[PDB]
Design a binder for this molecule. Structure first.
Ligand SMILES: Nc1nc(Nc2ccc(S(N)(=O)=O)cc2)nn1C(=O)Nc1ccc(-c2ccnc(C(=O)O)c2)cc1
Length: 272
């Protein structure tokens, strides 16, 4: 990663927190193309100082994905590791995370919008699959909305997939249990079962979110009941708008080897 000086970063409003991270809107002063000076809006992801031992994991996966440029993968500008901070400096996406957007626009998002966002997410995951790169945390909060749909000019929405964050292969077991049903059953049994197949399961969970107006699946279940949900081999309920329900269940297959490739997933989406 390119190293950015703390002096060139200005922290502004908080935009929430993640797993052992805090999120801020920021500005980066930089020299851009042709030597022009810019003050660029950025998203700053700050690793909690108390959790400095997770720094390697947060940055590694972000790094490996940033070695692969793709239109549906978020741009990272660099890192700031001056002083006692570990900061990821990322492109600022105008409309933020998709989960909050789905809730705030539920009475405006139709099946064609969902199918377009689903196709774009599958395209990003196919790219990752072909590069044998595991994401490990596909969820609606990690889908960033670059552009809204514009029925006036026929423009579809446009999304990017955000960075993975700290790997589930190093997180505490109680955090992994809280992330059921995004974390697949095999990874609850053994976090070292993290595999390409993991992302197919979480992709299914993410489609469920996209179809459910921002609801979080199994949110009414505490961690103990989420564990028993997997032990009893339950599936998620079909969303009210159930057009993607079969694909969701096909992806959320308790047998990891049976989950369809993203090429097949894309073919399925294109048939709807
Ligand atoms: N690049 C980028 N630009 C923006 N712009 C923006 C944000 C908000 C609003 S707003 N307030 O007006 O709605 C408007 C514009 N957000 N953003 C970004 O990456 N956000 C982000 C934060 C946290 C996770 C996350 C997901 C799952 N797990 C974790 C974990 O660490 O556990 C973390 C993912 C993404």
């Amino acid at each position: 990663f390119h190293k950015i000086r703390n002096e060139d970063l200005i922290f502004n409003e908080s935009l929430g927190q993640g797993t052992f991270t805090k999120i801020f809107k920021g500005v980066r002063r930089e020299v851009g193309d042709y030597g022009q000076l810019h003050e660029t809006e950025v998203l700053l992801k700050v690793l909690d100082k108390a959790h400095r031992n997770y720094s390697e994991s947060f940055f590694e996966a972000a790094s490996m994905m940033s070695k692969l440029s793709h239109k549906h993968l978020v741009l990272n500008y660099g890192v700031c590791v001056c002083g006692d901070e570990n900061i990821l400096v990322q492109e600022f996406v105008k409309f933020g995370s998709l989960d909050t957007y789905l809730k705030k626009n539920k009475n405006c998002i139709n099946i064609l919008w969902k199918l377009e966002v689903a196709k774009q997410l599958a395209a990003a995951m196919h790219f990752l699959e072909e590069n044998t790169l595991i994401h490990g945390n596909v969820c609606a909060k990690n889908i960033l909305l670059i552009r809204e749909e514009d029925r006036k000019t026929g423009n579809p929405p446009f999304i990017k997939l955000s960075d993975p964050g700290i790997s589930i292969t190093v997180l505490p077991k109680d955090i992994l249990q809280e992330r059921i049903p995004w974390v697949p059953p095999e990874c609850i049994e053994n976090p070292k079962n993290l595999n390409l197949a993991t992302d197919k399961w979480s992709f299914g969970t993410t489609l469920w979110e996209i179809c459910s107006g921002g609801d979080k699946p199994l949110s009414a279940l505490d961690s103990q009941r989420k564990l028993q949900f997997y032990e009893d081999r339950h599936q998620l309920p079909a969303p009210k708008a159930a057009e993607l329900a079969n694909l969701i269940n096909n992806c959320m297959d308790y047998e990891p080897d049976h989950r369809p490739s993203f090429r097949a997933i894309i073919r399925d989406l294109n048939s709807l």
